Ligand binder design. Structure first.
Ligand code: TYZ
Length: 115
């Protein structure tokens, strides 16, 4: 409260660390469904069903241009990618499997880097 501060995280390295994590996701061999935005013109149903599309290149642009206020808003966008993937794809599809794999991969990096 007013004039009563908790000790808080050293967050000075967060930008560099999120960038490193994003690089590792960009270079994962199962990253191919998530590298670019889904083509809303050519993929039936996607525009109407998926209210907030998100992909790695869009996250990269936002990270490079100061559009994440903190590391949690960054993690929300990464999770959005995989949440969207689960909404639109069968768990047994290649893309569905890719999504589950990448989520697991991300969350371990996240825990190991910040928790
Ligand atoms: C990220 C993502 O789900 N993208 C896509 C793209 C295209 C298809 C399809 O054509 O079936 C399915 C899923």
């Amino acid at each position: 409260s007013m004039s009563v501060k908790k000790p808080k995280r050293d967050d000075s390295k967060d930008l560099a660390l999120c960038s490193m994590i994003l690089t590792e996701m960009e270079t994962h061999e199962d990253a191919w469904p998530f590298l670019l935005p889904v083509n809303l013109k050519l993929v039936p149903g996607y525009k109407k069903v998926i209210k907030k599309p998100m992909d790695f290149s869009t996250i990269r642009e936002k990270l490079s241009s100061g559009q994440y206020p903190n590391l949690e808003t960054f993690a929300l966008d990464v999770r959005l990618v995989f949440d969207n993937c689960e909404t639109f794809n069968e768990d047994d599809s290649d893309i569905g499997r890719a999504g589950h794999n990448m989520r697991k991969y991300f969350e371990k990096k996240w825990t190991d880097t910040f928790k």
